[PDB]
Design an enzyme around this catalytic site. Structure first.
Site, mmCIF file in Angstrom:
data_model
loop_
_atom_site.group_PDB
_atom_site.id
_atom_site.type_symbol
_atom_site.label_atom_id
_atom_site.label_comp_id
_atom_site.label_asym_id
_atom_site.label_seq_id
_atom_site.Cartn_x
_atom_site.Cartn_y
_atom_site.Cartn_z
ATOM 1 C CD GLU A 140 -11.426 -26.923 57.498
ATOM 2 O OE1 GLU A 140 -10.569 -27.597 56.884
ATOM 3 O OE2 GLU A 140 -11.179 -26.266 58.540
ATOM 4 N NE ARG A 145 -14.120 -21.046 57.411
ATOM 5 C CZ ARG A 145 -14.895 -22.031 56.976
ATOM 6 N NH1 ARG A 145 -16.027 -21.761 56.319
ATOM 7 N NH2 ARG A 145 -14.547 -23.283 57.193
ATOM 8 C CG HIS A 178 -10.523 -18.539 57.828
ATOM 9 N ND1 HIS A 178 -11.147 -18.163 58.998
ATOM 10 C CD2 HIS A 178 -10.712 -19.876 57.716
ATOM 11 C CE1 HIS A 178 -11.692 -19.226 59.568
ATOM 12 N NE2 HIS A 178 -11.434 -20.281 58.813
#
Lengths: 214, 210
Positions: free
Chosen positions: B82, B58, B9
């Site tokens: 993540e 994001r 991102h």
């Protein structure tokens, strides 16, 4: 932390032909020459600390374009040469697959295998890695006091960069084939981290960029 | 060979703060929005076969910009999130090093270690790699007859891409710290050569920008 940039030379005629070069002193093509100028634009903005190049013309001519851009002299070292490919130098993928079929494909997956009379990846790394250690010992500016991000730029060849990067990363030799092949006028960046005051073998190298183009 | 592209991102309104994000659903910055538009131009010209994105905004916001440029529906998968950083999420490097001196630097060097309540790098690879195994069995067009270069684009995060790439590259876990961190709107490309564990992955590109 020391930044180390390695740039592969621009396109040659042999590249277009898929003819093994090795340490044959082939010439840049026109597209290859323009590629080095584009690459010098991008790498020039990073303000290199110094430029060391292979003495083979296709790398040297590429390096000089960076040197023009930066105003830096190009130093020359035989230890930055491409893998010597022995009896294979000057033969193409087609010809090699005829005489010893499978040999070429076996070669890319085994960093210890050398064409007859040539070097293995392990050979090329043994030859080039001490150059990095010399530069570590010779350039206190590098990753140092004033401008610690200015990189050392080595201008060389695809095999050498793969072999030297794998070695600096202390990858097991079995995993060196994981690093695919760099494009013409593409670059790779490792960053060298050391606990303040430490030895060269105590430097931990990290892969920042592999095979970026311009 | 099958081309697998992983895209990180764009900039957030947060990264600059040196604050561990983990699975905090932070927003892109204005630059992030323009970066995602930039990356879609570059990755769009390669015409991906399909786009799979993390549900963190994001990454999701980035993927949608690639999806618009390409006309592709964006697939969503929580397995692309993540690393969960546990007690560290939201703390600054200063605070972490004050709480646990050495832990943070020691962490970047041990893909097996996790902050309390978090995941290790190895954890992220184990949960995300089955998505790759699913895709290889699910999309025969991928690397297929007519258009074998159409890549699969996973839109995710730096920690995940490092762990997943290292896992696909079958690097020893002791060697996973070699893959440094990717920048905003950077991409990585592995190619799959010849079961699924019988596929050998090669690092083509790591951390290229736009």
């Amino acid at each position: 932390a020391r930044r180390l940039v390695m740039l592969r030379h621009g396109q040659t005629d042999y590249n277009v032909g898929s003819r093994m070069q090795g340490q044959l002193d082939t010439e840049l093509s026109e597209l290859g020459r323009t590629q080095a100028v584009a690459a010098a634009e991008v790498l020039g903005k990073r303000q290199p600390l110094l430029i060391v190049s292979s003495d083979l013309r296709r790398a040297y001519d590429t390096a000089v374009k960076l040197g023009e851009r930066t105003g830096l002299v190009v130093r020359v070292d035989t230890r930055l040469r491409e893998t010597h490919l022995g009896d294979w130098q000057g033969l193409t993928h087609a010809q090699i697959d005829a005489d010893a079929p499978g040999a070429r494909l076996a070669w890319r997956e085994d960093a210890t295998w050398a064409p007859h009379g040539g070097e293995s990846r392990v050979d090329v790394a043994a030859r080039s890695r001490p150059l990095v250690a010399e530069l570590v010992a010779s350039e206190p500016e590098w990753g140092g006091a004033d401008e610690p991000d200015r990189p050392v730029v080595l201008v060389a060849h695809g095999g050498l960069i793969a072999a030297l990067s794998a070695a600096l990363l202390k990858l097991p030799v079995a995993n060196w084939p994981a690093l695919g092949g760099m494009g013409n006028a593409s670059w790779t960046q490792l960053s060298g981290h050391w606990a303040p005051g430490s030895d060269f073998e105590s430097i931990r190298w990290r892969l920042d960029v592999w095979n970026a183009s311009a």
